[PDB]
Design a protein around this ligand. Structure first.
Ligand SMILES: [Mg+2]
Ligand SMILES: [Mg+2]
Ligand SMILES: [Mg+2]
Ligand SMILES: [Mg+2]
Ligand SMILES: [Mg+2]
Ligand SMILES: [Mg+2]
Lengths: 250, 243, 204, 237, 222, 233, 235, 196, 198
């Protein structure tokens, strides 16, 4: 019954640091590596399924999530914080946008909405910041393909490619070397797989890796036909097998 | 005593000590439990210890019937356990009322994990020092085990175990599932899946159980139920012949 | 009496070949008494045009609301709202007042700047979208407007001809309505340019 | 309160237990068709009116409650129990079953160990009564923990009471009548008084028996009270 | 309005006419009355037009969120429960009357919902001002275990009954077929039996016909 | 043990103690002495009033709650006002709704429960006042002792305040005599005034010192101050 | 929110301390326009320049801000400021006078300074706007909620240095093209980097609208900055 | 609507016709008016279909929760929940409900909750518009401790008269049998019961 | 009922407002000034339901005076009128609406033009060369349709107003006790004290 911490738990220290934001970022550093790469005709987000037991069924835990038919997210940091953020983002896409303009939000605006939910955990009474960094990959008619990073402070940045979590510094380097503005989606997936191999201890296969794209519309995944102006979702999670096919030609 | 050890704010290392401490509380009852999946059932076994002889043995349980279909075993102190039981029951009834169908095991798990995540983030709530193991035969997924912890984490299991001697049982089961190569126990009757579970607990813990040393919950298509001492005594006799 | 009959007025929109047209009369009355010869009922937000008939206090209020909302839309999205999107915004804005509605009959006209497709729509006072491709009518002479348009209309008219057809539909529907008329204005809308013409009509 | 120690304990609850331990000793005994409650009342002075500082409380008509620790906290818990029992009867028509009632108290007490703005209750409560399917005895700790009991004791004299209670369960494995358990309750309270002998005491007994009270909570008074006192006095020597 | 819903052996079909009216006047000669709650759960409405369209989109959006939250395909009984609970809360003031039909992991379903929040189940249903004409056709030809082809015929026939005999309905027939195995198929303007005959004359005006008082170019940009 | 454990009413000490409540109890001992005792027919309150100065008035210690009930205070006086107000209301509610005079015992239970909520709320404080409550109800004469902890006990007699231990030993001694002073108000008052004497390192108790209250069988609760107490000195 | 024995607001001073580490932003007000220039915080080749705005934000058609501090905090305030301007437009059918919008924001900041026990917003603003009462205006606001008017001003890192350089070369009859030149020069001299390249800059002007009588906000595209970086002679 | 519940030797049987009308139009000729609120607690609804469905849905919720916390609810408990809703909301509900249930202790039980929100425990109960025509028949033909087949006959004949006279009632006759044996659905057709 | 006229000439706006206050069968007062000055160069006349009439005017007057002092600036007639419309537009859907009709006469300094705004209780706004509320319009509008010119002087406009008041004294069933006439121009607001027999 009732909160006794009606004050900010994130305050400025004598040097201007916002301690709790700083610490949350450290929580992200300890988290499993995730990354995104933008091609000319797509975006790819990838991460490692670091399983907690070989008795757990890793398919029942998804680190890659659909936010809207054309938008997906991956994270580094605290899973539970991610899960609830995804719920809140899915909902805010409807209540703040779709229920108003009858269409899904463009990527920057949805990203902006998530950032607001995270900024608020940084200022409101009686709460800690979210211990996560998200990468949000999406498409919209008027902005084309985009990729965004969102930090515990609520700050976001558009990226051509980036990596967050454990081996982020090495991977960011590995990406600066490999990336150009003429990349097709298949090339970007190939680079994603390579970048992730440096970060991964054990087995590196379609069961231990999670990979999704923002490609073209899959009218097959729509669920109905007869409306020609509805072409289907651009978000698509690659299957275990689809991942393995691309490691044999690696 | 710094704040970062009293409430759920980040430590400089990026840890939440109250969460970590809540995980320790889970073992304070000194009870081990395990869950397996059959072909068309799911079985939970938990040790039953009644130290005081003034206690009514019938009222000492860590297995709860959440809904007609979902069952829950808790590793943790009873007061927190019953708190989680009540809520899960309430949440399960509300799902059915609003959405017209029975709350799935994994969904209740997700929901309870979400509630736990909140205590992780809001200062005025303490986490619950419990680990919740949810079982059923889902109408869409078949036999199911889903487990939530004070961190708000949950995942699905082929089989699982919880408590102080958790690891002994885990490695035992891990070893079995390497041989069978499948992700369940190939058996028709739940009666034989309960036996397997009891057997592999005996071997992993190196202990013999009487009918009063155990607690069994069984979920089949459209019912979850707990066995009486006598249903268990029958099981103990069945293993004794051959083994 | 009837809130939609207090002030009077009409709005019609049509589509032609690579164009749209939107027209309104200029009357503002108070029952029998004509008050203003200069009450325009068509507005725009970027390249999206919105006419409104009904109670005039609601016509004004809604213009100010949609200016407000399209202004904020443009700052966030960094582009101007498109016809199809605006229609959806008008709709939900109206339904939000379901049990206390604006007493209006909005009409949306425009060309989608990406697809070049001409677009018109209509609504009832609680935001139900009328999605005709040919013409949309609204106001205290809507019965007369339906009749005119249903006869005069034909698809793919060139801007200069669509202007004649829409002007004729409006002028003659207005002249059979005691609450409509007193001047008229017509917009001809092309992807590149928009022309506005004040019509000469009976002042009675 | 809402603070876990590094080894997963709750020091505030543990301290609340010390307040219980500090209190008067109270007991409950389950018989084959009812339950018996008894409590020790320390006579601070001759100025206290005999029989007139009633510690045992009734909830609804069929439930008795006794407690050791901070008496005011016990009253707070019984008030709540009564609201919780009235609410149940209002919706479901039937009077609240004992396990149902136990959990209602249980969740309420546990709630007072979740938030930094509150302290745990400084009592352990022994309670029970007769419902649709038998007699039930419970004991509820400051942590919200509770289980069913054959016999239960709390407070200063809890150890000797438990020893006597353990002995009864061993000599009478097939039951034990309400009329007998009332006597035995007088005895156990008298034995447990050994610890608080520096001051005089007064004995309070109450019972809820299917055959003896018609499944309703009743105070033991008059000839039945005196006869039990006698038994206790005669078996102490 | 005429809306029907017909069950067959492997699924469910819904159909509707394409006329909206403002009293005696026809506003849209070819609107779509068939709405989507989710990919395989569709909906038809009579009553307050804005109300059926809204309650459909609200429950549509919430169902989407529910599906994502639960990692399951949406079920017809969920759309049903949410719609009925919402309509009830508003004591009938949301004038939505619906036939909701679809397929989910548990089979195929056909339900009616009335504005006050009561629901019913059935093998064949109709709503709208063309309700009774269509029910007369359905009661004349429905049999247990229709094939897909038979079911479309029967539904399509029922809408025609309303198109021809009920003034509140007209124009074209829309159909949506929902089979248990497959994607839902939305057959827009399945039948078009009401083509306007060519007019006797052309009414295109000689340019300059209209008197213009003044003229100016309107500015779009900034 | 005493260090970090007396910050609020919401913290237990490692001994099981609530220090704020024990500190509120210490405000009573600081307060001026007052005595209560009863026979079968009457109940009496006697209070030594204290003046803060020689030019000041002696502050009142007796508050009337209903025609059949009243209390004397020792401790924080404003708290007594809060608690007697509530008690007046509970009496009032009982009359208006049930047409019943509130039993003195229930008045005890009601004060106990109110005091308790302030021993468990954060940002509140315990009451810092002790009360002696007398009444005549449907079961005769009653006297209660109220402690800010919530503990309310029914006694034949008692005293609370500074040096109160003197009067309490006296009453414990005089028990068998005063309990039988039935149908004689003036003798019972005499037995109470003589009881408050055992609690005086002070002096003679004057006609301003002194405050007496009585209730019984055919006597509504009345307060005697000044002139009207002269005949008891 | 509390006071120090000195009569200072701890949390405000620490918020201002936070700001001094943020990239410098510069506003210069000329007779025929206003310049806003700001330095992005040391980035990466992989940062998408084209679709990024971390320091320069549009408030309405006639008013803009340059940000220094927590971006996420700024976005909160910008969004409310955007609303306040639209409320004013709805009420009066006139675009909000620049000062009224500045005061409003400044008051919301002052609020967190005085009650509610929430951390202040770690944000400093330079406002650039035009209205038909005061013409071109330049304002500053910080976490305290104080605001002041300026002819040239800087926020973020090295304001001490930047302010002295502006004081030296600023003269009241400057044209916008001369103010553009000053702003870039000043940044280059106060940078903590090898060179001031286009990929590390955000640039905007508020001019007298090419040829009209209207006011135009030009937010410089990445390429346009690279052009104006050569023209002025820094390449 | 014609609805009834009858207690017999082995338990209790609920019966109802299948017709729902709006005015003189039959909106549904095959309605199922026998509503389950628990394994062996059922009810027949009369009045506003919206109101009674919403009520039945809430009671079913309350009893599901009840069963998770405290076991199986008595029929009396079910009736109490219905009465609670019906009474406390009488100014906004037109709902007449007949509750019927079975357990091993209390055997077969019937409760009727008419418009006001009062509760009445009865050997048998009739309600709905069609019931008024069978008050005579039922009072003259009902006996206690009837056999199953006798009870099915008593309902069949009763509702056939109710259907015969009340235009609101009609269609098929549905029944639910509630005994220790379990739950049994019965359906009877016009071609049969009309010939009685 | 109450007479509220406004005419906009070339260099000023003129307001004329009836002097009578009538309750039932009695004329309680015959010198009532149905006007509030909003700022130095903006005047508002009002008519409608008994209490709300003055209450609304004084509320608007307070708000505009607050704005003036806060900004040390005078709002344009257009902005003031927009504010007023919004307050009435809000009021129309409130618990108990203001039943007040108003004319706003103002002289805009930035533009150097007079401006006349007619606003009814619904929050219907329109800028007019001449306007009226209530029945008075049914007489005066046709007269001003004929006799009005855009270039008229302040004096010419007063003659035209006098012609309107004569018509109303001739044809109106109720005795409104003449008008108080006020002029709003570049020098502010002044009242013509002689009109009753001028
Ligand atoms: Mg917490
Ligand atoms: Mg806490
Ligand atoms: Mg119309
Ligand atoms: Mg006309
Ligand atoms: Mg104990
Ligand atoms: Mg019939």
């Amino acid at each position: 019954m009732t909160d006794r911490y009606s004050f900010s738990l994130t305050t400025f220290s004598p040097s201007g640091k916002l301690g709790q934001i700083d610490y949350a970022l450290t929580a992200v550093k300890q988290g499993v590596t995730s990354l995104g790469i933008k091609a000319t005709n797509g975006v790819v987000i990838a991460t490692e399924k670091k399983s907690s037991s070989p008795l757990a069924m890793s398919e029942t835990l998804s680190k890659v999530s659909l936010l809207t038919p054309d938008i997906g997210a991956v994270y580094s940091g605290m899973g539970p914080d991610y899960r609830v953020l995804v719920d809140k983002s899915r909902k805010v896409a409807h209540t703040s946008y779709k229920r108003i303009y009858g269409e899904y939000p463009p990527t920057k605006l949805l990203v902006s909405e998530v950032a607001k939910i995270m900024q608020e955990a940084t200022q409101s009474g009686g709460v800690r910041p979210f211990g996560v960094s998200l990468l949000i990959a999406g498409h919209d008619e008027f902005n084309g393909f985009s990729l965004y990073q969102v930090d515990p402070s609520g700050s976001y940045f558009p990226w051509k490619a980036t990596a967050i979590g454990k081996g982020s510094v090495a991977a960011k380097t590995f990406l600066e070397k490999r990336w150009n503005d003429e990349l097709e989606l298949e090339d970007a997936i190939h680079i994603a797989l390579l970048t992730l191999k440096e970060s991964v201890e054990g087995e590196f296969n379609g069961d231990t890796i999670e990979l999704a794209i923002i490609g073209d519309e899959n009218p097959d995944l729509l669920g109905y036909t007869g409306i020609p102006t509805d072409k289907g979702p651009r978000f698509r999670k690659l299957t275990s097998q689809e991942i393995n096919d691309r490691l044999e030609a690696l | 005593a710094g704040y970062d050890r009293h409430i759920t704010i980040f430590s400089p290392e990026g840890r939440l000590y109250q969460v970590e401490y809540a995980f320790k509380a889970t073992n304070q009852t000194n009870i081990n439990s395990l869950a397996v999946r059959g072909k068309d059932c799911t079985v939970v076994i938990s040790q039953k210890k009644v130290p005081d002889k003034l206690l009514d043995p019938t009222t000492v349980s860590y297995i709860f019937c959440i809904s007609r279909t979902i069952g829950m075993v808790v590793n943790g102190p009873i007061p927190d356990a019953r708190n989680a039981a009540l809520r899960a029951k309430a949440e399960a009834a509300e799902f059915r009322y609003k959405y017209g169908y029975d709350m799935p095991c994994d969904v209740l798990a997700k929901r309870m994990a979400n509630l736990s995540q909140i205590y992780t983030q809001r200062a005025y709530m303490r986490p619950l020092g419990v680990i919740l193991t949810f079982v059923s035969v889902d109408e869409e997924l078949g036999p199911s085990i889903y487990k939530t912890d004070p961190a708000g984490y949950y995942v699905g299991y082929k089989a699982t175990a919880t408590g102080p001697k958790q690891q002994e049982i885990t490695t035992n089961l891990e070893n079995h599932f390497k041989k069978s190569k499948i992700d369940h126990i190939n058996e028709e009757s739940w009666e034989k899946v309960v036996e397997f579970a009891i057997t592999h607990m005996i071997d992993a813990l190196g202990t013999e159980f009487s009918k009063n040393d155990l607690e069994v919950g069984v979920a089949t298509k459209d019912k979850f139920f707990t066995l009486s001492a006598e249903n268990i005594e029958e099981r103990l006799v069945a293993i004794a012949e051959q083994d | 009496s009837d809130p939609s009959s207090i002030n009077g007025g009409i709005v019609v929109a049509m589509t032609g070949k690579d164009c749209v047209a939107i027209a309104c009369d200029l009357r503002l009355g108070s029952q029998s008494l004509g008050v203003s010869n200069k009450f325009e009922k068509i507005f725009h937000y970027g390249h999206v045009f919105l006419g409104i008939t009904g109670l005039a206090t609601d016509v004004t209020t809604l213009n100010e609301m949609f200016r407000y909302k399209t202004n904020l839309y443009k700052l966030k999205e960094e582009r101007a709202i498109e016809p199809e999107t605006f229609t959806q915004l008008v709709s939900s804005s109206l339904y939000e007042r379901r049990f206390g509605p604006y007493f209006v009959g909005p009409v949306v006209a425009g060309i989608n700047s990406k697809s070049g497709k001409p677009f018109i729509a209509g609504f009832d006072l609680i935001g139900c979208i009328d999605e005709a491709k040919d013409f949309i009518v609204s106001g205290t002479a809507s019965d007369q407007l339906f009749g005119m348009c249903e006869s005069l209309y034909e698809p793919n008219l060139e801007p200069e001809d669509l202007f004649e057809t829409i002007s004729q539909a409006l002028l003659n529907a207005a002249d059979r309505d005691a609450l409509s008329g007193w001047g008229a204005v017509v917009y001809i809308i092309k992807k590149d340019e928009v022309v506005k013409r004040y019509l000469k009509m009976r002042q009675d | 309160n809402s603070v876990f120690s590094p080894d997963g304990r709750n020091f505030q609850v543990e301290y609340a237990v010390k307040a219980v331990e500090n209190g008067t000793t109270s007991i409950g005994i389950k018989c084959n068709d009812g339950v018996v409650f008894a409590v020790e009342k320390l006579i601070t002075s001759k100025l206290l009116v005999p029989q007139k500082n009633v510690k045992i409380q009734v909830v609804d008509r069929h439930i008795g409650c006794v407690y050791s620790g901070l008496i005011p906290d016990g009253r707070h818990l019984v008030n709540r129990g009564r609201e919780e029992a009235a609410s149940f009867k209002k919706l479901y028509k039937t009077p609240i079953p004992i396990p149902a009632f136990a959990d209602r108290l249980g969740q309420y007490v546990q709630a007072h160990t979740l938030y930094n703005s509150v302290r745990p209750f400084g009592v352990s409560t022994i309670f029970g009564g007769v419902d649709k399917n038998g007699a039930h005895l419970y004991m509820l700790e400051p942590s919200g923990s509770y289980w069913g009991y054959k016999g239960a004791a709390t407070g200063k004299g809890r150890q000797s009471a438990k020893a006597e209670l353990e002995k009864l369960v061993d000599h009478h494995p097939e039951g034990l009548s309400a009329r007998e358990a009332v006597k035995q309750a007088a005895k156990i309270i008298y034995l447990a008084h050994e610890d608080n002998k520096e001051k005089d005491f007064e004995l309070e007994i109450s019972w809820c028996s299917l055959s003896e009270t018609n499944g309703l909570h009743k105070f033991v008074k008059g000839d039945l009270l005196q006869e039990a006192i006698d038994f206790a006095q005669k078996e102490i020597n | 309005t005429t809306i029907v819903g017909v069950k067959f052996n492997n699924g469910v079909v819904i159909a509707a006419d394409t006329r909206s009216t403002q009293g005696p006047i026809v506003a849209d000669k070819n609107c779509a009355k068939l709405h989507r709650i989710s990919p395989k759960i569709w909906c038809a409405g009579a009553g307050t037009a804005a109300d059926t369209e809204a309650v459909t989109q609200l429950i549509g959006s919430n169902i989407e969120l529910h599906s994502l939250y639960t990692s399951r395909e949406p079920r017809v009984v969920s759309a049903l429960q949410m719609l009925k609970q919402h309509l009830f809360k508003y004591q009938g003031h949301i004038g939505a009357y619906l036939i909701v039909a679809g397929v989910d992991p548990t089979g195929s379903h056909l339900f009616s919902i009335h504005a006050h929040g009561s629901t019913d189940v059935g093998y064949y249903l109709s709503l709208g001002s063309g309700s009774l004409a269509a029910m007369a056709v359905l009661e004349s030809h429905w049999k247990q275990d229709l094939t897909k082809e038979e079911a479309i015929k029967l539904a399509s026939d029922a809408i025609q009954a309303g198109i021809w005999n009920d003034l509140g309905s007209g124009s074209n027939v829309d159909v949506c077929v929902m089979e248990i195995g497959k994607d839902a198929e939305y057959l827009r303007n399945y039948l078009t039996p009401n083509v306007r005959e060519e007019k006797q004359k052309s009414y295109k005006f000689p340019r300059g016909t209209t008197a213009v008082l003044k003229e100016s170019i309107v500015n779009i940009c900034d | 043990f005493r260090n970090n454990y007396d910050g609020d009413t919401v913290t237990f000490s490692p001994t099981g103690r609530l220090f704020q409540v024990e500190y509120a109890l210490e405000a009573i001992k600081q307060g001026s002495v007052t005595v209560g005792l009863r026979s079968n027919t009457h109940a009496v309150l006697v209070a030594l009033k204290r003046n803060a100065d020689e030019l000041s008035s002696y502050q009142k210690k007796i508050i009337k709650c209903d025609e059949h009930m009243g209390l004397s205070l020792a401790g924080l006086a404003p708290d007594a006002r809060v608690l007697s107000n509530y008690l007046r209301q509970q009496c009032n509610y009982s009359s208006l709704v049930f047409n019943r005079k509130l039993a003195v015992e229930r008045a005890g239970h009601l004060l106990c429960d109110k005091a308790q909520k302030n021993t468990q709320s954060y940002g509140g404080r315990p009451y810092g006042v002790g009360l002696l409550i007398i009444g005549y109800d449907k079961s005769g004469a009653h006297l209660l002792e109220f402690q800010p902890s919530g503990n309310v006990t029914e006694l034949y007699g008692t005293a609370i305040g500074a040096r109160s231990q003197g009067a309490k030993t006296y009453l414990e001694r005089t028990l068998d005599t005063f309990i039988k002073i039935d149908g004689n108000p003036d003798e019972l008052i005499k037995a109470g005034v003589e009881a408050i004497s055992q609690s005086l390192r002070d002096e003679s108790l004057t006609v301003d010192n002194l405050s007496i209250a009585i209730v019984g069988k055919d006597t509504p609760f009345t307060i005697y101050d000044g002139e009207a107490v002269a005949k008891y000195i | 929110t509390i006071f120090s024995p000195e009569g200072r607001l701890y949390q405000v001073e620490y918020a201002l301390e936070s700001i001094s580490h943020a990239g410098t932003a510069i506003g210069i007000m000329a007779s025929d326009g206003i310049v806003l220039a700001a330095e992005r915080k040391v980035t990466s080749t992989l940062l998408e320049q084209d679709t990024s705005t971390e320091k320069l934000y549009k408030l309405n058609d006639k008013i803009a801000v340059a940000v220094a501090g927590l971006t996420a905090d700024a976005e909160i305030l910008i969004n409310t400021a955007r609303i306040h301007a639209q409320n004013y437009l709805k009420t009066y059918n006139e675009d909000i006078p620049v000062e009224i919008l500045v005061r409003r924001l400044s008051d919301i900041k002052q609020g967190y300074t005085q009650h509610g026990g929430l951390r202040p917003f770690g944000v400093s603003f330079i406002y650039a706007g035009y209205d038909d009462r005061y013409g071109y205006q330049l304002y500053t606001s910080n976490p305290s909620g104080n605001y002041t008017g300026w002819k040239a001003i800087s926020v973020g890192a090295n304001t001490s240095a930047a302010q002295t350089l502006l004081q030296m070369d600023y003269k009241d009859d400057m044209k916008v093209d001369d103010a553009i030149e000053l702003a870039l020069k000043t940044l280059s001299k106060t940078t903590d980097s090898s060179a001031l390249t286009y990929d590390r800059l955000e640039f905007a002007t508020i001019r007298k609208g090419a040829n009209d009588g209207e006011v135009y906000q030009k937010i410089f595209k990445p390429q346009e900055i690279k052009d104006i970086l050569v023209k002025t002679g820094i390449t | 609507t014609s609805i009834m519940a009858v207690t017999f030797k082995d338990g209790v049987i609920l019966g109802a016709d299948s017709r729902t009308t709006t005015g003189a139009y039959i909106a549904n000729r095959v309605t199922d008016k026998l509503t389950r609120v628990h394994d062996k607690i059922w009810c027949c609804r009369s009045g506003s279909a919206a109101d009674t469905q919403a009520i039945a849905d809430i009671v079913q919720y309350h009893l599901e929760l009840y069963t998770s916390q405290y076991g199986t609810p008595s029929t009396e408990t079910a009736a109490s929940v219905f009465k609670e809703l019906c009474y406390e909301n009488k100014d906004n509900l037109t709902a007449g409900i007949i509750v019927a249930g079975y357990d091993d202790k209390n055997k077969g039980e019937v409760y009727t909750i008419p418009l006001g929100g009062s509760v009445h425990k009865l050997p048998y109960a009739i309600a709905g518009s069609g019931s008024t025509f069978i008050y005579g028949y039922c009072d003259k033909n009902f006996r206690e401790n009837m056999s199953k087949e006798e009870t099915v006959d008593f309902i069949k004949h009763s509702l056939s008269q109710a259907i015969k006279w009340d235009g609101s009632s009609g269609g098929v006759i549905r029944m639910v049998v509630l005994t220790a044996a379990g739950v049994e659905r019965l359906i009877f057709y016009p071609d049969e019961y009309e010939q009685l | 009922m109450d007479i509220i006229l406004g005419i906009r000439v070339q260099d000023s706006v003129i307001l004329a407002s009836s002097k009578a206050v009538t309750r039932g069968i009695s004329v309680l007062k015959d010198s009532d000034d149905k006007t509030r000055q909003l700022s130095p160069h903006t005047l508002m006349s009002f008519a409608g339901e008994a209490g709300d009439t003055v209450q609304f005017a004084e509320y608007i007057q307070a708000n505009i005076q607050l704005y003036s002092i806060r900004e040390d600036y005078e709002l344009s007639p257009q902005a003031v009128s927009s504010f007023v419309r919004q307050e009435l537009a809000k009021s129309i859907r409130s618990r108990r609406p203001y039943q007040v009709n108003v004319l706003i006469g103002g002289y805009d300094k930035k533009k150097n033009k007079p401006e006349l705004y007619q606003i009814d209780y619904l929050g219907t706004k329109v800028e007019l060369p001449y306007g009226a509320h209530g029945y008075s319009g049914f007489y005066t509008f046709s007269l001003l349709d004929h006799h009005y010119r855009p270039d008229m002087t302040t004096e010419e406009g007063l003659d035209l107003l006098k012609l309107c008041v004569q018509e109303l004294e001739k044809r109106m069933p109720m005795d409104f006790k003449g008008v108080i006439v006020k002029i709003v121009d570049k020098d502010g607001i002044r009242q013509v004290d002689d009109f009753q027999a001028q």
